[PDB]
Amino acid sequence: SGPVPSRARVYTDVNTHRPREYWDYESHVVEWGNQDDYQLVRKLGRGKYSEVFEAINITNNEKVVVKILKPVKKKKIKREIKILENLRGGPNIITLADIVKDPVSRTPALVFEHVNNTDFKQLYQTLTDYDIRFYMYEILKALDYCHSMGIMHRDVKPHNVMIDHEHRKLRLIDWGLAEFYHPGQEYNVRVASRYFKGPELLVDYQMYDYSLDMWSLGCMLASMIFRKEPFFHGHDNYDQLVRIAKVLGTEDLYDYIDKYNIELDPRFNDILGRHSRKRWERFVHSENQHLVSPEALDFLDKLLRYDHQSRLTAREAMEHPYFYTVVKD
Numbered sequence: 001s002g003p004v005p006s007r008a009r010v011y012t013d014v015n016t017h018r019p020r021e022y023w024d025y026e027s028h029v030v031e032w033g034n035q036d037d038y039q040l041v042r043k044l045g046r047g048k049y050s051e052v053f054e055a056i057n058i059t060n061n062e063k064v065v066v067k068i069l070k071p072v073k074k075k076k077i078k079r080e081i082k083i084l085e086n087l088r089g090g091p092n093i094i095t096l097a098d099i100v101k102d103p104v105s106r107t108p109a110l111v112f113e114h115v116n117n118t119d120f121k122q123l124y125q126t127l128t129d130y131d132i133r134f135y136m137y138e139i140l141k142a143l144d145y146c147h148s149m150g151i152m153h154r155d156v157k158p159h160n161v162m163i164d165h166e167h168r169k170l171r172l173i174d175w176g177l178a179e180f181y182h183p184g185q186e187y188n189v190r191v192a193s194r195y196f197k198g199p200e201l202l203v204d205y206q207m208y209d210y211s212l213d214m215w216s217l218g219c220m221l222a223s224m225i226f227r228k229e230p231f232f233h234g235h236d237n238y239d240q241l242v243r244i245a246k247v248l249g250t251e252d253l254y255d256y257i258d259k260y261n262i263e264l265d266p267r268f269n270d271i272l273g274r275h276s277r278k279r280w281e282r283f284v285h286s287e288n289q290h291l292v293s294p295e296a297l298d299f300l301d302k303l304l305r306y307d308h309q310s311r312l313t314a315r316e317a318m319e320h321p322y323f324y325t326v327v328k329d
C-alpha cells in the first residue's frame, strides 16, 4: 500500500492561494538585456552548473556579479529566474539585477548585485559565539521568508551563504535547486550535497517540504559549534545515513521508516546496524567549548530529527533562547 503521505505543517497552501503564474514557471517568458552592458573583470569561482565572474556595468559604472550557466534545461533556468524574481527584495535574498545571453556560451548569464565577501581566514578565526548566533539568525530570516513565499531552497550549505562582515550583511545565494512547495507533490531526492542531505532524501521519501532546509541548517550549526566540517562525513549516500545514525541512533531511524511505511533499499540493512543515540557532549572539546552552550545544543537537537514533521520551523527556530541576545540587539 506504499509510503504514507505528508504535508508541510506551515505555509502549506501558500502557492495554491497565489495566481498560477507565481509558481507555474514553465509559462514564464524570459526577456534578455544587453550583454554589452557588462564587461567581465575577473573570474571568482567555477561550480559544476556555472562560472561566476566579477563584472562592470559600463552603463553606470556599478560593480556586478555575473553567473554564466553551463547548458541546463530551459525549464530549470525559468524556475531559478522565477524564484529569484518572486523572492527579490526579501530579507537576505540575493538580488537578481539582469539576465543576458552570453555571446560565447550562447547560454544565459544571471547578473547579480555585488556583495563584498570576507575571506574564510579572517572569518572562522575569532568568529565569536555571538557572531555565529547573529549570522544564524540572518540565515533564518531568509529561510522563513522563502518558506512563507512557498519555496524550498534545497541546497543550504556554507558555499551558498555570503557574509560581508564589515557591514554585518548576509545573503543566501544559488537558487538553482530551489522549488515551489505544493501539498502532495513528490520531488526529486537527488538534490543537495551529500554532507547536507536530509534523511528523507537518503531513504527515498519524495513527499518532503521546507523542513528539508532545516536539517541542512542543523548540519551547518553542528559543523560550526563543534568545529568539524563536515559534521556527517559520509563516504557515499548509503554511508551518509550510517554517519547520521551513529549520532542520532538507529531506534528513531527505524521508527521514522515505520511511521511513513518507507521501503528501505536492502543495501541499508547490511550496513545500518544498531546504534545508540549519542549525547552531544562527546563532540565537545576545549578547542570548541567557547561556541557550545546548553541553548546551542538544545537548538541543534531540535533541528536534527529524522522525522521532518518534528524539526523546528524557521519561525520556531528564530524564537529559540539561543537567539535571545541577538533579538534584544
Ligand SMILES: Cn1c(=O)n(C)c2cc(S(=O)(=O)N3CCC4(CC3)CC(NCc3ccc(-c5ccccc5)c(Cl)c3)C4)ccc21
Residues within 6 Å of the ligand: 044, 045, 046, 052, 065, 067, 094, 112, 113, 114, 115, 117, 120, 123, 124, 127, 131, 132, 133, 135, 136, 157, 158, 159, 160, 161, 162, 163, 173, 174, 224
Ligand atoms: C553574488 N554571487 C552569486 O550569486 N554567486 C553564485 C556568487 C559566487 C561567489 S564566489 O564563487 O566567489 N564564492 C564567494 C565565497 C564563498 C563561495 C562562493 C565562500 C562562501 N561563504 C562561506 C561561509 C558561509 C557561512 C558562514 C557562517 C558563519 C557563521 C554562521 C553561519 C554561517 C561562514 Cl563563516 C562562511 C561564499 C561570489 C559572489 C556570488
